């Protein structure tokens, strides 16, 4: 079915619960060894959120490679994208250490700090420009350079420098404030104007490698965001932007990264961005 005549039938219907269960269900299930072993214990927020071995993020180091990151590639959309947990207070180093390596430019964080009265992820990157952040494990320094706050999100740039070479290189921080503790936005529209920021820096373009993206457990709200993304895509490019299946496209991605949409109300919001985001790109 098309989507917006199949969303109006699920709400009549009152069946979200049951969609997603469908979807629960249909999903991938591949062995997560690594993420398991008893050395990397704490290198994982939630016992029941791991990476899949075949499409992990390896760090370039012999000791221990391991870090809870997934590469999602999206082939017809000519897309990928890196999810991960928000960093620990173990692993903070571990996090830049993976987007020096593999070439990121931007990093999408979907949170806040602290949540419900507890915390949700390290404070991994410096709040003032005069006070560096140093990462000796890894061997890496960061670099507060300008902050633009606005009403739903804060842009960062940044300066990550490889101290063993004294390259240097600029990271774009994108931090959506707004998502509300429980639940899901009323509207897409500020998520949507979020996304095409990103898009607009560069920071999702092939001439880089992938973004990465996160949350708390890195499968949730930052599933949303790469899924309205991709299904986007898909409807500029062919001929019929009716045929863009969502759930397809969602169980797409559930084969590289475990538990993508943990609710059905972020199900459905996610049919609702793309819905409205299709009716801005044009044409309008
Ligand atoms: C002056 N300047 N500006 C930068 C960045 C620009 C964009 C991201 S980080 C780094 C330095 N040293």
């Given at each position: 079915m098309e989507m917006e005549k199949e969303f109006e039938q699920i709400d009549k219907s009152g069946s979200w619960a049951a969609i997603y269960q469908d979807i629960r269900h249909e999903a991938s299930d591949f062995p997560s060894r690594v993420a398991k072993?008893?050395?990397?214990?704490?290198?994982?927020?939630?016992?029941?959120?791991?990476?899949?071995?075949?499409?992990?993020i390896k760090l370039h180091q012999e000791d221990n490679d391991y870090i809870n990151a997934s590469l999602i590639k999206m082939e017809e959309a000519q897309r990928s994208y890196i999810l991960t947990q928000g960093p620990l207070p173990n692993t903070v180093g571990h996090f830049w250490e993976m987007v020096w390596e593999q070439k990121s430019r931007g990093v999408v964080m979907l949170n806040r700090v602290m949540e419900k009265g507890s915390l949700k992820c390290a404070q991994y990157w410096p709040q003032?420009?005069?006070?560096?952040?140093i990462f000796?494990?890894?061997?890496?320094?960061?670099?507060?350079?300008?902050?633009?706050?606005?009403?739903?999100?804060?842009?960062?740039?940044?300066?990550?420098?490889?101290?063993?070479?004294?390259?240097?290189?600029?990271?774009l921080h994108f931090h959506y404030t707004t998502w509300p503790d429980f639940?899901?936005?009323?509207?897409?529209?500020?998520?949507?104007?979020?996304?095409?920021?990103?898009?607009?820096?560069?920071?999702?373009?092939?001439?880089?490698?992938?973004?990465?993206?996160?949350?708390?457990?890195g499968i949730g709200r930052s599933g949303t965001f790469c899924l309205?993304?991709?299904?986007?895509?898909?409807?500029?490019?062919?001929?019929?932007?009716?045929?863009?299946?969502?759930?397809?496209?969602?169980?797409?991605?559930?084969?590289?990264?475990?538990?993508?949409?943990?609710?059905?109300?972020?199900?459905?919001?996610?049919?609702?961005?793309?819905?409205?985001?299709a009716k801005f790109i044009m044409g309008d």
């Open positions: 072993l008893p050395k990397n214990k704490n290198r994982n927020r939630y016992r029941d959120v791991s990476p899949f071995d075949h499409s992990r003032k420009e005069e006070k560096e952040m000796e494990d890894t061997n890496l320094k960061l670099t507060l350079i300008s902050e633009d706050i606005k009403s739903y999100y804060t842009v960062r740039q940044l300066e990550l420098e490889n101290l063993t070479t004294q390259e240097t290189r600029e990271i639940g899901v936005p009323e509207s897409p529209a500020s998520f949507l104007n979020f996304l095409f920021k990103v898009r607009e820096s560069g920071s999702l373009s092939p001439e880089h490698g992938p973004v990465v993206v996160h949350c708390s457990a309205a993304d991709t299904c986007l895509l898909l409807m500029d490019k062919r001929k019929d932007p009716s045929s863009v299946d969502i759930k397809k496209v969602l169980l797409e991605m559930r084969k590289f990264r475990m538990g993508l949409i943990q609710t059905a109300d972020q199900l459905r919001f996610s049919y609702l961005a793309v819905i409205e985001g």
